[PDB]
């Protein structure tokens, strides 16, 4: 309810101001003992992990960890916090998130915003949430590219500890993206020997991708035994927005638009992975059938994070009740 209401006024504010506004506002709210949702059981199990239910936060709404537990409150089967990186950075100059209300879409090029690794690691030690806890795990911008495999190394040895499962987004080339998967799962199976457990590796695509693209990727994911892809990240399309304000506007776009290529995309996936490594289906679920259309496409689990703009809050319980 709190959100619905007060969104005609937040909409009325530049978007990245209503979106920090917002979240400052659900965290006071969560200390005051509001905002908690109650959502089905649905235990779902996958990668080795007891997920509570099948719906997650997708990475980039909480990227530095610092609103966990109001977050957790709203009942989310698992939360995606990051991306983050070894050192903070400022992002893209402002204004970098767009809201494209009639098409119910967002574009963004935040720019991988951030207050580094060492501080979400606090962030994490302080707040109470004890469930499912995704990292998202990136390079810093400023970082040689011929370096920055060792920014994902710092990240993943630095979060190893506390993270549920530890999620690296891949590029559409081949090369780099064999040598920094070799590198990552070899390091992540000495972490493992050395903390006495093991935590998933998962990797993140975007939509726009080649059928050459996608049996390249699986390729990937099957030889290095990767445990899970998320299907997608944004989109470069603008199909949707063409004839709408900032439809123009650089950068990735997400909500109802990427739908449909997002959904696509993790069909193809699972035609090629054959159920062989678990997909979690992300990109334009604003209702709760979205969610099910996912699953019915190939998905195990499934992330939300532009229909929290729009549908707001309550589509955490939308989509648990509409999955099978
Ligand atoms: C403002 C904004 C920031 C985002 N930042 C990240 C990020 O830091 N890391 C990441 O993997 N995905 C990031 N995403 C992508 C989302 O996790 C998700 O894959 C995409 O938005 C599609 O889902 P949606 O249409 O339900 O929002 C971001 C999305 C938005 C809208
Ligand atoms: C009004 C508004 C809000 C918003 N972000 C947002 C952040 C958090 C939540 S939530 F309520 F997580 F529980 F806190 F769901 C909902 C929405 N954005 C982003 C771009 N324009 C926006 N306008
Ligand atoms: O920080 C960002 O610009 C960002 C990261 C990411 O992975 N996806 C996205 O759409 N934006």
Request: with cysteine; hydrophobic share 40%; charged share 20%.
């Given at each position: 309810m709190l959100y619905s209401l007060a969104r005609p006024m937040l909409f009325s504010l530049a978007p990245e101001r209503a979106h920090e506004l917002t979240l400052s506002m659900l965290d006071k709210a969560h200390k005051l003992g509001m905002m908690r949702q109650t959502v089905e059981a649905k235990p779902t199990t996958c990668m080795g992990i007891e997920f509570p239910n099948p719906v997650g936060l997708a990475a980039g709404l909480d990227k530095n960890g610092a609103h966990i537990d109001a977050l957790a409150g709203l009942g989310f089967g698992f939360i995606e916090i990051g991306t983050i990186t070894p050192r903070p950075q400022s992002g893209?100059?402002?204004?970098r998130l767009f809201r494209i209300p009639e098409a119910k879409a967002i574009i963004n090029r935040?720019?991988?915003?951030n207050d580094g690794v060492d501080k979400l690691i606090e962030n994490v030690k302080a707040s109470k949430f004890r469930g499912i806890l995704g990292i998202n795990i990136g390079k810093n911008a400023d970082t040689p590219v011929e370096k920055a495999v060792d920014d994902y190394l710092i990240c993943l040895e630095k979060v190893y500890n506390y993270a549920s499962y530890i999620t690296v987004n891949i590029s559409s080339s081949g090369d780099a993206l064999t040598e920094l998967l070799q590198t990552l799962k070899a390091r992540q199976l000495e972490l493992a020997e050395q903390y006495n457990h093991y935590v998933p590796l998962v990797l993140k695509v975007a939509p726009d991708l080649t059928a050459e693209d996608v049996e390249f990727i699986s390729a990937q994911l099957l030889d290095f035994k990767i445990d899970g892809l998320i299907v997608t990240n944004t989109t470069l399309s603008r199909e949707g927005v063409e004839?709408?304000?900032?439809?123009?506007?650089?950068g990735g776009l997400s909500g109802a638009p990427v739908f449909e290529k997002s959904t696509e995309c993790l069909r193809l996936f699972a035609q090629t992975l054959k159920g062989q490594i678990p997909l979690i289906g992300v990109g334009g679920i604003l209702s709760g059938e979205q969610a099910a259309a996912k699953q019915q496409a190939g998905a195990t689990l499934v992330q939300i994070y532009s229909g929290l703009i729009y549908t707001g809050p309550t589509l955490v319980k939308q989509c648990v009740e509409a999955m099978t």
């Amino acid at each position: 309810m709190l959100y619905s209401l007060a969104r005609p006024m937040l909409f009325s504010l530049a978007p990245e101001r209503a979106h920090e506004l917002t979240l400052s506002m659900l965290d006071k709210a969560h200390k005051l003992g509001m905002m908690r949702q109650t959502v089905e059981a649905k235990p779902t199990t996958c990668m080795g992990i007891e997920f509570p239910n099948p719906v997650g936060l997708a990475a980039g709404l909480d990227k530095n960890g610092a609103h966990i537990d109001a977050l957790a409150g709203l009942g989310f089967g698992f939360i995606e916090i990051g991306t983050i990186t070894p050192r903070p950075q400022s992002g893209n100059p402002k204004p970098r998130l767009f809201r494209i209300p009639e098409a119910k879409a967002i574009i963004n090029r935040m720019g991988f915003n951030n207050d580094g690794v060492d501080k979400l690691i606090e962030n994490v030690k302080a707040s109470k949430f004890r469930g499912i806890l995704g990292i998202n795990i990136g390079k810093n911008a400023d970082t040689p590219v011929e370096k920055a495999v060792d920014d994902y190394l710092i990240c993943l040895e630095k979060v190893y500890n506390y993270a549920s499962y530890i999620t690296v987004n891949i590029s559409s080339s081949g090369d780099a993206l064999t040598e920094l998967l070799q590198t990552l799962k070899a390091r992540q199976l000495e972490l493992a020997e050395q903390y006495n457990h093991y935590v998933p590796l998962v990797l993140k695509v975007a939509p726009d991708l080649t059928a050459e693209d996608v049996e390249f990727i699986s390729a990937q994911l099957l030889d290095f035994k990767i445990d899970g892809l998320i299907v997608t990240n944004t989109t470069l399309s603008r199909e949707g927005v063409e004839n709408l304000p900032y439809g123009n506007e650089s950068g990735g776009l997400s909500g109802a638009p990427v739908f449909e290529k997002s959904t696509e995309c993790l069909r193809l996936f699972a035609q090629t992975l054959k159920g062989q490594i678990p997909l979690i289906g992300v990109g334009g679920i604003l209702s709760g059938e979205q969610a099910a259309a996912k699953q019915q496409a190939g998905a195990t689990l499934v992330q939300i994070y532009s229909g929290l703009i729009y549908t707001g809050p309550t589509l955490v319980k939308q989509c648990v009740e509409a999955m099978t």
